[PDB]
Design goal:
13 helices, Aspartate Aminotransferase, domain 1, binds pyridoxal-5'-phosphate, 18% strand, Aminotrans_3_PPA_site (chains A, B), 2 domains, binds ligand 41E, Aspartate Aminotransferase, domain 2, pyridoxal phosphate binding (chains A, B), homodimer
């Protein structure tokens, strides 16, 4: 198919994320290649190379087509594409499980592989509920979180997404009613934690778990909070006998400046989810880790097993590329790399603070955000960035980037310049 | 890692489908290769070649390491591993969407890609709910099904799984309460459809959709029913204005002897799910298709969009291998191939009917089932099958196979021989 033919098929037959059929304000742009930090896109019928400032939705941490990751995939392909994980095991699964247990916050000893972040969140919830059932406490079945969160699109995951953000409005009566604390603030205020505790205390006997995104709330608004809040959550959960689940599907694998965002706080959750960058952006894969205590309690309960098993559980191809991606991250000075990227993002976005429509500029590791005082027009913003050689996708009032770790200083300058200019056009009209 | 090292890591760190940690009666067997219809497994320190009689949980329709599928993957890898589907489109997605629209039951004109069958079921339910909300009838929010079904492991999917088979007593107050008709019989009985209608009639104003597995119920007990029931369902659904959803995640792509199981009845559902064999068993991928009417009604509603969007939506690698797998199937005389396979299964399983512990023998397309009078002990069955050069995984009281389409007549008889011998041992204790 030609780009024109692709557009015709797409408009007629393809759903996109959170999209319509037949009512799209702008056609999607045809992507024809991806290499390193660059996508090749079709603009006016011609192929142009642009920076993947979004890392293709947090995924492309090592860039596209990294020789080591391409090689890992092709190597596994020649030996074993896939076998069922029911009754069989294999080297890619064992290698990955071992790596993940070693590098995640202390105490996370068991690994349940699945196909996506939303599924890994549902697995996490299932672990939590089956845990309390194994303790003879089946009343502990609700979840608590703070506002501003995102945990995926399956129906349980939706129930802990921000009620405004995730629109409880058109989903009233269908979603499980969970417990929501107020939006966690940026700066540390012990009074927020005390209030969180007081609210949790009232519900402790019906709560299985607190579930949060640590340090960075991603799709719900690109908000940052002080790591000390996670220290408080660990303490509150310990004292009131409620499990703590960290959703690191967006934050994992160096993105926030630590290997996992929990490391900023020096705290371990009872259960942890990982996903987006796990395979370095090659293939869908996710994992849910839990402590020995959680695993043994589930296994010793009346049920005797965790009642979940995805068809493609622990897929050898996805596991093999993940092993390569993680080893590639660990085998370099990733901490200095992210620090340099953060510095580059800070320097490049600093000029945005003075712009009339800009309310905030914030950076955390390899994440850069310009917050505006009004919604960003995608029909204006997208071509504005493309003409500058950058692929950006604003959301609501946010112009943001989470660039590949391989981006040079010159590339970060190019990304930030495009971001600043998108923000300039917001306050123009 | 050596096979012994894999076992050690596995026992300590890896969850398996529907399993415990540290309480497994049998260790998993190490798989070290897969090629064509054969797996290389480690048994007592030695590699052995065995037939993949399960097609690696219904996935490996063309066998493992098929050159056309291997090549399709590496070709796509050379150009573009992945890009975000938010604001971008690509050739693999367009090629696959066009194919799927053109081969599925008539009227299924739009395609939503996701990463697993369970997610695709959640997307189907979301489509149905959003459809009725777009019609100003939000009271239509429940689902109806018949007993014996399986639809995946996420929480909404669980709500329509058989209440006994999905131990809904273990998930009492947590699952959505859905409407269950009695187990659909094997033989056609107009009285059953009359009762189905009478029950649906009572709930019509609160029902968004009927959701069923067409013709073959897989994980809920490998049961077959007369296709005429689907004709009745389509009629009932039309007359009472309830959407019809077919879950073809197990039945799709030739498995039951028709391209899709709905084709046995000439029936088109409003929404359809596909998954297991979609990529030929290489990679996780699923799709939910719906009619233009459903798509337009969602798009014209208050939301203006289907509120779902997986990170790896329409992954180019997975889509590219799926294109090759679907084209490979359509490019051969698959119908004759499946008829030959079914004949081989029927001929080879006939002797089992006489065995003392066997209650039924049944075949539908490339699916062969020996139903026993007692739950099958995996500790006996697995080694017994491996001794006969075949990988079999019984569940409950069922010794069954869904072999790769590429199995020769000799290989099919080897599979059935092993199945018969397993059934013979079941009656030996
Ligand atoms: C998750 O909801 C529940 C709760 C309690 C019991 C159940 N039971 C079921 O879902 C039965 C359905 C079957 C699904 C498939 N299954 C499996 O062992 C496997 C699943 C994946 C397998 C692979 C990829 O090898 S095997 C056996 C159980 C479900
Ligand atoms: C699930 O029901 C609702 C209804 C209304 C709002 C919401 N949730 C939201 O608006 C916040 C969730 C965001 C998630 C990310 N998002 C996206 O468009 C994308 C999701 C995946 C994208 C990719 C892979 O490119 S873009 C925008 C919405 C959910
Ligand atoms: C994206 C995301 C999910 C859902 O992952 P999918 O792969 O899109 O299902 C869950 N939690 C968080 C924190 C995420 O960023
Ligand atoms: C396996 C299966 C599912 C779930 O698919 P996963 O990829 O395991 O999530 C759903 N429906 C049916 C009919 C299936 O056979």
């Amino acid at each position: 198919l030609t780009p024109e033919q692709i557009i015709a098929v797409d408009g007629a037959h393809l759903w996109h994320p959170y999209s319509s059929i037949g009512r799209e304000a702008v056609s999607p742009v045809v992507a024809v290649a991806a290499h390193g930090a660059w996508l090749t896109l079709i603009r006016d019928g011609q192929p142009i190379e642009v920076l993947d400032a979004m890392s293709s939705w947090w995924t492309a941490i090592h860039g596209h087509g990294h020789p080591a990751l391409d090689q890992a995939l092709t190597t596994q392909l020649r030996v074993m594409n896939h076998v069922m994980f029911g009754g069989l095991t294999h080297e890619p699964a064992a290698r990955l499980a071992k790596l993940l247990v070693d590098i995640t916050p202390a105490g996370l000893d068991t690994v349940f592989f699945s196909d996506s972040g939303s599924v890994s969140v549902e697995v996490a919830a299932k672990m939590a509920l089956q845990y309390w059932r194994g303790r003879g406490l089946p009343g502990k079945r609700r979840l608590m979180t703070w506002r501003g969160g995102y945990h995926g699109d399956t129906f349980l995951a939706m129930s802990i997404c921000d009620p405004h953000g995730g629109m409880h409005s058109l989903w009233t009566d269908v979603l499980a009613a969970q417990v929501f604390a107020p939006q966690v603030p940026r700066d540390y205020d012990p009074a927020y934690s005390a209030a969180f505790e007081a609210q949790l205390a009232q519900h402790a006997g019906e709560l299985a778990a607190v579930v949060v995104e640590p340090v960075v709330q991603g799709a719900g608004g690109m908000r940052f909070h002080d790591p000390r809040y996670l220290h408080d959550l660990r303490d509150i959960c310990r004292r009131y006998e409620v499990l703590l689940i960290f959703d690191e599907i967006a934050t994992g694998f160096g993105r926030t400046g630590a290997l996992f965002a929990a490391d900023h706080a020096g705290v371990s959750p009872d259960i942890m989810c990982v996903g987006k960058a796990l395979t370095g952006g090659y293939l869908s894969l996710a994992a849910t880790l839990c402590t020995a205590d959680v695993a043994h309690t589930i296994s010793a309960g009346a049920a005797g097993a965790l009642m979940h098993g995805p068809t493609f559980m622990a897929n050898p191809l996805a596991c093999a590329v993940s092993v390569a991606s993680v080893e590639l991250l660990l085998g370099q000075d990733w901490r200095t790399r992210i620090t340099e990227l953060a510095a580059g993002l800070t320097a490049g976005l600093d000029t945005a603070r003075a712009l009339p429509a800009v309310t905030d500029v914030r950076v955390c590791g390899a994440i850069g955000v310009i917050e505006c005082d009004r919604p960003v027009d995608l029909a204006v913003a997208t071509p504005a960035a493309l003409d500058r050689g950058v692929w950006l996708r604003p959301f609501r009032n946010l112009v943001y980037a989470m660039p590949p770790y391989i981006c040079t200083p010159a590339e970060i300058t190019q990304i930030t310049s495009a971001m600043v200019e998108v923000a300039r056009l917001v306050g123009s009209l």
